[PDB]
Design a binder for this molecule. Structure first.
Ligand SMILES: O=P(O)(O)O[C@H]1[C@H](O)[C@@H](OP(=O)(O)O)[C@H](OP(=O)(O)O)[C@@H](OP(=O)(O)O)[C@H]1O
Lengths: 190, 201
């Protein structure tokens, strides 16, 4: 009952898990992708292995792309809203500089401190307008705030694991998520 | 649905398309089916290709270990590629190819011993020269249905051989064994292609 070559293993150990998770987002896409990999693998055993390896060999292209997205992610006259916009903007700007700061230990350590205080200022400002929304569906505020502080902690964790791992791409990805969460706070004020 | 002209679709053209370009040489329908599958999925969900690539990158350790295991297995994957011609030179060609693949297969076991690894590299070099010499002799002595295909495959082998040498140089710099494992597997595959071409030619 075992005629499948060992070279085909990555199809089931790598691709199938990815397809299975994709079925919950786009069933049609997952099936099409899976069907295409199955077809190609069955007709030429070893193809999935080489495809996966080539993708790994192009990680640098992926690092560059993840860096550029981070750099790009930085792009009501009420006084409280002007403050919220300013604080959010400063945080996003600092986070977007990470790719060009991470290669220097010293300057990267200061950047982390800049990120800490920037988030602190943002949270303070968030608490300010927080005290003026007088419960008008404020639940969405306490919710979004916590989603932000959750990604903030998740980012802090990513930094710690980075100082032992050395995997910058995880920092870039996490910083990107933090920015998106920063925007979510601003947007929630609908 | 949408067009893949957005920033988030970049990896589709920067990563996947170059990869798919090679498969046309192996299986056109497969390169086309895969290309159509990714572009289709990307149009429906822009950013999907990027997520797929990121998930594959997360399986690096799994892929790395499997690649080493595959290299170790190469020593017992022989009979499928053997040349089925009576002449003595073809039997000698089968032997030279087998011997090369055997030494390449021992790399994972040897790479953790500088002294042993240095010798193994010398043995690989000699095994390659002997393999090429046997190929050249058989090229000159016999007729074939597709001599051009054979010569092309030999030159492909030479490229992957030099690529292997370059990988060794780099390994002595950064000490990443996986690159050596990958390069050895590809050299092994090229060795098998030579054999398979003699079988149909
Ligand atoms: O040492 P391990 O645990 O395998 O992890 C590293 C990281 O994945 C590097 O990327 P990152 O800095 O983003 O963590 C990667 O380089 P690139 O991603 O720059 O290509 C290294 O491979 P090499 O590229 O072969 O050095 C790889 O060895």
């Amino acid at each position: 009952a075992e005629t499948t070559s060992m070279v085909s293993m990555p199809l089931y150990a790598v691709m199938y898990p990815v397809f299975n998770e994709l079925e919950r987002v786009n069933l049609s896409a997952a099936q099409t992708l899976r069907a295409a990999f199955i077809k190609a693998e069955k007709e030429n055993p070893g193809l999935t292995q080489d495809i996966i390896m080539k993708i790994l060999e192009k990680k640098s292209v992926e690092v560059n792309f993840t860096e550029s997205l981070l750099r790009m992610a930085a792009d009501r006259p009420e006084p409280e809203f002007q403050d919220l916009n300013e604080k959010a903007r400063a945080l996003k700007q600092i986070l977007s500089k990470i790719p060009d700061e991470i290669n220097d230990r010293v300057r990267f350590l200061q950047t982390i401190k800049d990120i800490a205080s920037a988030i602190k200022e943002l949270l303070d400002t968030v608490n300010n307008v927080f005290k003026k929304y007088q419960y008008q569906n404020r639940r969405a505020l306490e919710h979004q705030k916590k989603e932000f502080v959750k990604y903030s902690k998740s980012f802090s964790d990513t930094l710690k694991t980075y100082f032992k791992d050395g995997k910058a791409i995880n920092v870039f990805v996490s910083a990107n998520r933090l920015i998106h969460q920063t925007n979510l706070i601003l947007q929630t004020f609908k």
